[PDB]
Symmetry: C2
Subunit: 247 residues, 2 copies
């Protein structure tokens, strides 16, 4: 069993207790996040993990299955275009749109902090992007901007506050690739995906047991918990996962 957790909104107690339960019991937990590697590292989370909405898969340096290429103390499997290429295509899209398209790459850490309510240091880590660009769009211009993005070969998502631009960043494909990189085929045969967002659909579709712990309404065919948030996660571990170890 492998547990994929796309719980940015949710995992930041009895939730950490639940996580620790899984870990102490040898069950792999793989963070899947919109965050950058720098942000993930600041949380103290160890690889393997999936960053920037499936843009990149980070593996321990000594992962037994060889893949990707060394970057820092990791081996990274890049599934999406690199940030520099997205940024270059964005310049083209801006030219098409005939108006400014601004992203985090254009903004100071101080500006990003002010806009997000993050500290300056957390803003710097949010700015350390490898695949995906966060956009700061005029609501009235969204329609025209999104068409320009498509015109130049870019893909877009909406993360809750801001639109994003990338190419080939998909949580589902990243989840599928990691399972296909797993040292123990048997352990990976059954995957659970826990998510809180309707934009966790690609994740849910790539796992065998999908559970939504978000505050919205659960995607059809996606098991849900009585309560959202940490309690949702705790409940899912206690009710759906831990019991399986008695088998």
């Amino acid at each position: 069993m492998i547990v994929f957790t796309d719980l940015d909104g949710t995992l930041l107690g009895p939730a950490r207790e639940a996580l620790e339960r899984l870990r102490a019991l040898g069950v792999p937990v793989v963070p899947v996040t919109a965050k950058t590697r720098k942000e993930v590292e600041a949380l103290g989370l160890e690889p393997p993990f999936i960053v920037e909405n499936g843009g990149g898969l980070y593996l321990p340096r000594d992962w037994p299955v060889r893949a990707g290429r060394p970057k820092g103390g990791y081996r990274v499997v890049s599934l999406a275009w690199p940030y520099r290429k997205v940024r270059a295509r964005l310049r083209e899209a801006e030219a098409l749109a005939g108006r400014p398209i601004l992203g985090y790459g254009d903004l100071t850490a101080e500006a990003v902090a002010r806009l997000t309510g993050l500290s300056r240091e957390a803003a710097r880590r949010a700015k350390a992007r490898e695949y995906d660009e966060t956009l700061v769009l005029c609501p009235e211009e969204v329609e025209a901007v999104l068409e320009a993005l498509e015109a130049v070969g870019l893909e877009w998502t909406h993360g809750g506050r801001f639109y994003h631009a990338a190419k080939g960043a998909d949580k589902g494909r990243a989840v599928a690739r990691l399972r296909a990189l797993w040292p123990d085929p048997e352990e990976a045969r059954f995957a659970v995906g826990l998510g809180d967002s309707l934009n966790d659909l690609p994740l849910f579709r790539a796992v065998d047991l999908a559970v939504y712990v978000g505050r919205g309404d659960p995607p059809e065919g996606v098991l849900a918990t009585p309560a959202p948030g940490p309690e949702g996660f705790r409940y899912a571990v206690e009710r759906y996962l831990l019991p399986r170890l008695s088998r």
Copy 2:
């Protein structure tokens, strides 16, 4: 006589340099007539143009004097003394943060943007954009067209003043070309020399300049404001004509 002159489109050509402007500027010098640049540009931008003080920067927010100016005024800053007329950039940026809160949406300006971004939005080199970012009084805003009116209301509500400079809205407080001109004339070493002021500009953004001088000349491409002289051709070509026709006759 003192000649106050707006930069871009006036004294500067379609590249940001000097055309028939040199001959014109040269003859004023030979005739002992001081020429004072009045510009939206920052001091760093003016310096890159090789221009010497006195000059007026950021739409009247700052008046820069040679450090050995005969009339003591302003605060020492290296080779200059600086007379600050407008709120400092830091205070403007602070008030922008409050305005952004009142507006319930991001208000972005040069201070929020990298030099690379500014260069891209303006077509400037990265180096020129760094100089455009060295702002002391006035902030250049990058506003959503449909958010403008709500943004402007918010600016005024926090005590800021706004203008529009061709491409971008700007925010400042107490930055006025006419008031900077009046101050500099009051600080002029020889009052007889400052008694008659000429103002040359190319845009309606120069109305404050035109109001503050005794002879206003418009060398822009459109129709000149009420009470302002015109020339057959725009830019440096008009500047040449204005010197020859409107200025020399008062010096001979």
